[PDB]
Curated annotation (Swiss-Prot):
The chain holds residues 2317 to 3268 of 3268 of the full protein. Residues 550-886 form the HECT domain. It is found in: Nucleus, Nucleolus. The gene is TOM1. Belongs to the UPL family. TOM1/PTR1 subfamily. Probable ubiquitin ligase protein involved in many cellular processes, such as transcription regulation, maintenance of nuclear structure, cell cycle, mRNA export and rRNA maturation. E3 ubiquitin ligase proteins mediate ubiquitination and subsequent proteasomal degradation of target proteins. Involved in transcription regulation by interacting, and probably mediating, ubiquitination of some subunit of the SAGA complex. Required for SPT7 ubiquitination. Participates in mRNA export from the nucleus by regulating the transport of hnRNP proteins. Interacts with the ADA3/NGG1 subunit of the SAGA complex. Interacts with KRR1. Changing C853A: Loss of function. Induces a decrease in transcription activation. The active site is at C853 (glycyl thioester intermediate). Present with 350 molecules/cell in log phase SD medium. This is E3 ubiquitin-protein ligase TOM1. The modification Phosphoserine is found at S60. It comes from Saccharomyces cerevisiae (strain ATCC 204508 / S288c).
Length: 886
């Protein structure tokens, strides 16, 4: 029956106004908007005849009890329509308005602000203050000769004589700049502190220009004056004004939808092409700071909420960027040449480096344009309403392909130069520009290709589109992007935040550092949770000590343990030995919660019947969160788990190569089932024999596991499931608490960034290798140690860093570490083996492989050191769909 207007109660049933279009307001704009209608239609009831009864003077009940502001808004205004009347005459305003020519410091200006505010509450003065301000801003500050003209038109009116005389001179220090600064400060203060000036600005006034009709366009002419657009202080306030006068202009249109009296009554302004272009021009101004940029973005969004604006804004942005992108192509090309001929000692011509460093460069302009498009098609759209396909279209019409290719060519030169100014950061605003073109993209399953090899070094991104630019580019400039993050690691918390979506590119060391600070360093002030273990009881002496304690406090509290095994709590190797060997007892076969992996005794594994342990649930959860503490806190708990374990730790589908070192004969048969020897000759029903103390019930792996048979057609799925079961469902649920203990310690969303070998080298201290020990504790199959590809293959080994070589070792040794003595104790599946470089020509130019089941390795004879290097790097790094899967 009633509708609340700022908190009051009026029976709208007995009122003309429809609330459905008012409720949309946040109960704030409703107050003033209602008052506008109240007073206008009350005057209509006063003068215009033939009125209906719904209004009824909106009742005395809603005049005497309606908020006093509205009462005074109607009554006092009604009493003053023809006692709180205008304080000063019109000429007073002129005399007062001369203050703006009295250039003064701050503080002194405040008195003017409160006085001018108090001069409101009077349609006479308010409509006089605004006009005078617009007069000064639009017809006085252009020449300092027009300033004198308006000053004489102002001072003359202060005396009542609107006749002009006396040629009054200015203080001779007053500059259009100072008048503008003071006037805009005052205007902003009024618009912000007091309402009812917004509506005056937007609403038509009726004394085709549109200026005399709409006050707002007086401020839009300020956006084409070099006097204004060359100052970062006047632009800031001139944009803070429009960010408010535009917000309201948007809300009204949205709320109306149906009944739009305001659109039909105030005649809400209509924006043409040029008007929106003036607003957009701000982002291309040299004076556009970060603040001016945010306010301009808000103004753009608000105007976009209007009709016929979105398309205009998009078209203008596209044209702007296309205009810009021609200069960037030229500026980059000159740089690409210069950087290639800088040799040593010399530096880039400062003029060519000044077009990439100054805050008013084009790269910043391109970044601002692209950030504006992102804002437009992202700001408050819920991530599902986004027409990212349409968004990409916009980026495709910019023909920025050349710029991206020039950028790639430019970056390649830095990677291959000895320069002082190399400092690719100068192109950082350009690199981040590419990361706005792709931030909202899908970038999913385009990474999942692999197989490809050393097809880069000539890629042109001229027409690669937007969905096929991220990965090809980042992959290409991996080294440069990793060297840029190693100096400013905050790039990952900002411009390079998008790189989280291509973790394959982030090297290990940067990955580790990003991981720790984000997660670990956040938690400090850790309390004490000591535990007193024995040096032999160790595992149980710790576990049973807590055995049910809070999963949060345990990790968020320091472990100052005072263990009885020896003397000491920390500070001297006593606490780290606890961490060091605790998991050594978790593997303890007596507990039977782990298994020396069938391949290697050195390597452990949860054990197919890991739950067989009388106490397994609280013995794995221990293991899980134990790793988390060490990983979070520090040190290592050396194990070897298994590749699928890490994959399961990262919740990712597993490979078959795992079976190679998990059950050799099983793999030789499972591989035999997939290929090698399968013509339904393997036969045997589907599903996997489900051991129960020797009782094989061959559970239906899939619903109809036994129902299906292992035939040539179904061989692939059968083996996939068997390996999956033997690798995951063999331990199925028992690992779950192992995952909860860890995942509670180290959240999954900050482990997904790592991958397999990286996670291991994190968990286990990164190893170091001896090349010479990789020359004697080795085996050269069908290949001389200096035949051709083997030699510069050793060169490739040399050129790799620790993180890469450890993978190379882990690409032949299964899951890392060195068996001591210099590889001589090559602990194969039987327990003794030797590194084996099997030629295995097999399309000698294709990617290599290996079988750590035998400490084996495949070396397709390539021809080129570069191609071999690339294939080797891809393979060792690769963990999915290459070395992983099949």
């Amino acid at each position: 029956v009633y509708v609340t207007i700022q908190g009051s109660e009026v029976d709208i049933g007995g009122t003309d106004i429809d609330p459905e279009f008012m409720n949309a307001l946040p109960d704030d704009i409703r107050a003033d908007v209602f008052a506008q209608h109240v007073r206008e239609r009350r005057a209509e009831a006063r003068l215009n005849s033939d009125h209906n009864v719904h209004s009824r003077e909106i009742d005395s009940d809603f005049l005497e009890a309606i908020p006093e502001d509205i009462r005074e808004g109607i009554l006092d205004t009604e009493a003053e329509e023809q006692y709180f009347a205008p304080l000063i005459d019109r000429a007073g305003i002129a005399s007062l308005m001369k203050s703006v020519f009295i250039s003064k410091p701050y503080i002194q200006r405040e008195i003017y602000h409160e006085l001018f505010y108090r001069l409101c509450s009077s349609k006479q003065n308010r409509n006089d203050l605004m006009n005078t301000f617009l007069f000064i801003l639009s017809e006085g500050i252009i020449d300092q000769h027009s300033l004198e003209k308006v000053y004489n038109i102002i001072s003359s009116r202060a005396m009542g004589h609107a006749k002009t005389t006396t040629v009054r001179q200015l203080p001779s220090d007053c500059t259009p700049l100072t008048v503008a600064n003071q006037t805009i400060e005052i205007l902003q203060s009024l618009i912000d502190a007091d309402s009812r000036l917004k509506y005056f600005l937007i609403a038509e006034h009726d004394n085709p220009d549109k200026k005399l009709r709409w006050p707002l366009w007086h401020l839009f002419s300020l956006l084409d004056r070099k006097l204004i657009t060359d100052e970062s202080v006047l632009m800031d306030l001139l944009t803070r004004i429009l960010q408010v006068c535009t917000k309201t202009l948007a809300v009204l249109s949205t709320s109306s939808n149906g009944k739009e009296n305001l659109s039909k009554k105030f005649h809400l302004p209509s924006f043409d092409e040029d008007d929106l272009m003036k607003i957009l021009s701000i982002i291309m101004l040299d004076s556009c700071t970060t603040r001016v940029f945010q306010q301009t973005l808000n103004i753009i969004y608000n105007l976009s909420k209007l009709q016929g604006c979105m398309s205009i804004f998009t078209k203008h942005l596209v044209s702007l960027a296309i205009s810009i992108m021609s200069k960037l192509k030229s500026a980059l090309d000159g740089l690409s040449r210069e950087v290639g001929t800088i040799t040593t000692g010399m530096e880039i011509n400062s003029e060519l480096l000044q077009k990439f460093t100054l805050p008013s460069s084009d790269q910043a302009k391109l970044l601002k344009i692209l950030t504006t498009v992102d804002f437009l098609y992202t700001h408050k759209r819920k991530e599902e309403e986004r027409n990212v396909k349409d968004l990409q279209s916009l980026y495709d019409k910019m023909n920025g392909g050349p710029v991206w290719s020039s950028l790639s060519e430019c970056l390649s030169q830095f990677e291959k130069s000895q320069a002082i100014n190399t400092s690719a950061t100068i192109l950082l605003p350009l690199i981040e520009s590419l990361m706005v073109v792709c931030r909202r993209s899908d970038l999913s399953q385009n990474r999942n290709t692999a197989v490809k090899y050393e097809d880069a070094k000539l890629l042109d991104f001229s027409k690669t589109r937007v969905e096929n630019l991220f990965f090809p580019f980042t992959d290409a400039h991996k080294k440069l992007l990793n060297q840029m993050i190693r100096s400013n690691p905050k790039l990952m918390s900002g411009p390079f935040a998008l790189l989280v979506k291509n973790p394959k590119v982030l090297d290990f060391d940067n990955k580790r550092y990003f991981f720790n600070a984000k997660l670990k360093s956040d938690n400090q002030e850790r309390p004490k949770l000591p535990i007193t273990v024995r040096r032999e009881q160790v595992f149980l002496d710790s576990y049973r000590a807590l055995f049910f304690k809070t999963n949060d406090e345990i990790k968020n509290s320091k472990l100052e343990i005072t263990f009885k095994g020896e003397s000491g709590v920390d500070a001297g190797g006593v606490t780290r030995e606890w961490y060091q060997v605790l998991s050594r007892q978790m593997f303890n076969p007596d507990y039977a919660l782990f298994l020396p992996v069938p391949s290697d005794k050195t390597t452990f594994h949860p054990n197919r019947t890991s739950g067989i342990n009388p106490e397994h649930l609280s013995f794995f959860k221990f293991i899980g969160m134990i790793i988390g503490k060490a990983i979070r806190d520090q040190c290592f708990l050396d194990c070897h788990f298994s590749r699928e374990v890490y994959k399961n730790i990262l919740g990712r589908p597993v490979s078959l190569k795992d079976m190679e070192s998990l059950d050799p004969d099983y793999y030789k048969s499972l591989v035999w089932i997939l290929e090698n020897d399968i013509t339904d000759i393997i036969e045997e029903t589907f599903s996997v024999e489900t051991d129960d103390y020797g009782e094989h019930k061959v559970i239906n792996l899939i619903e109809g596991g036994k129902d299906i048979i292992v035939t040539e057609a179904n061989k692939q799925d059968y083996v996939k499931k068997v390996v999956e079961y033997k690798l995951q469902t063999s331990v199925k649920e028992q690992m779950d608490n192992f995952l909860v203990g860890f995942y509670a310690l180290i959240s999954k969303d900050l482990i997904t960034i790592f991958d397999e070998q990286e996670l291991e080298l994190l968990i286990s201290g990164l190893p170091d290798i001896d090349v010479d020990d990789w020359k004697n504790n080795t085996t050269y199959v069908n290949y001389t140690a200096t035949c051709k590809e083997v030699s510069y293959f050793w060169r490739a080994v040399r050129s790799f860093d620790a993180e890469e070589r450890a993978k190379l070792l882990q690409f032949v040794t299964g899951t890392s570490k060195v068996p001591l003595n210099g590889f001589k104790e090559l602990s194969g599946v039987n327990g003794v083996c030797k590194f084996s470089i099997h030629r295995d020509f097999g399309s000698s130019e294709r990617l290599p492989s290996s079988h750590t089941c035998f400490n084996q390795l495949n070396l397709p004879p390539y021809e080129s050191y570069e191609t071999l290097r690339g294939s080797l790097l891809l393979a060792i790094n690769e963990g999915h769909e290459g070395f992983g899967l099949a």
